[PDB]
Amino acid sequence: HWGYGKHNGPEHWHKDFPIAKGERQSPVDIDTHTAKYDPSLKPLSVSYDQATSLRILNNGHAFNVEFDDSQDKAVLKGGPLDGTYRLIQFHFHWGSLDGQGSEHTVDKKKYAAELHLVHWNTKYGDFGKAVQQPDGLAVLGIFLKVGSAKPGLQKVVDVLDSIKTKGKSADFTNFDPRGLLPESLDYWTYPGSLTTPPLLECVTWIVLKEPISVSSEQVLKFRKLNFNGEGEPEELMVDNWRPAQPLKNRQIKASFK
């Protein structure tokens, strides 16, 4: 029943999921001049050499590319993190137009889209147990702007017409997520939540300062997907982002000056 419309969209979520109004919700606006530079933060460690993708799925909210997370194959560590986080899936949030789409904002600036690479803390043994803990997940967030094509994204864009509607899935093997990463790993970090229901307050957010560029044709293909299932009235999959939420009692830290 939750979704992104007038009747079931973000402003409605708190009725089913009262933690919507909690003390550590995401996303947030990143005010780049109020963020504290922290020389004690470690470089982020992104080890994606042995990543194994399995499938891609339209869930009626976005498309998820899912990875085999049954061994220590694609891991995040270092940065603000203690221990080891394993890659389970990535997805995107995007707009009806290039001027909106991102969930996090930077000095109120909205990007065309935002990529979420979702990882779970290996001390909790799997994703389902991790989301039930305050340090269960690490999400690497990367902004997309429209300009030059990202070649490493085309394999994703090409398969989308095979998962047009809610519930469709396709196998999706040997996709390399290193092809979605910008040059710099300079980041902001703050404690928050899932940005979709159930909105659990289990995420260490790691948001890259440097966006990647994607072409207008690549993002246009995201916009041809559907929120509805096959054989129901077409509702295009656009504006599947949650707006910025109150910062409340939180400091956003930066890895860079």
Ligand SMILES: NS(=O)(=O)c1cc(C(=O)CSc2nc3cc4c(cc3[nH]2)OCCO4)ccc1Cl
């Ligand atoms: N948008 S986000 O905050 O990066 C983020 C989004 C997702 C999604 O897949 C959005 S749709 C979706 N979110 C879920 C969260 C869950 C789940 C099933 C879920 N299905 O199983 C039980 C509780 O956790 C999953 C994890 C994270 Cl971290």
Ligand SMILES: [Zn+2]
């Ligand atoms: Zn997300």
